[PDB]
Design a protein around this nucleic acid. Sequence first.
RNA 1: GGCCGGGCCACCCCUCCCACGGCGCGACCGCUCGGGGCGGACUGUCCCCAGUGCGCCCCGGGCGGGUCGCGCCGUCGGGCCC
Length: 48
Amino acid sequence: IRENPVYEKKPKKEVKKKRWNRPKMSLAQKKDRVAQKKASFLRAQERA
RNA sequence: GGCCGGGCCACCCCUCCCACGGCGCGACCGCUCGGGGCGGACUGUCCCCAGUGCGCCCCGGGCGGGUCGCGCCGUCGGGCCC
Ligand SMILES: [Mg+2]
């Protein structure tokens, strides 16, 4: 430690831009999901 | 009544720039009632069923803003009335 305290960083740049997280859904997607759920529920009733 | 010369305007021609307004034609930018091809995600129609955004590029219609913009039209317009 006394002889060499200097820190050198480790380089890493050859990384592809991969996303591991689900992106936030859009307003159009949420509205469509609500519409599909309503349609499916009405369909289930009319099948009875 | 003047007594000689100058300009400027009224007139004919042809002639430049600018301003303002209108119309049309480009090129650029921004703003989509939409069409093609891959990546996620959604629905109780789940047999290649259905529907929604997103990333790149290619087409289609309309709108506005800048454009030495470019032409045309108008001004008892302006340029010491070029
Ligand atoms: Mg003159």
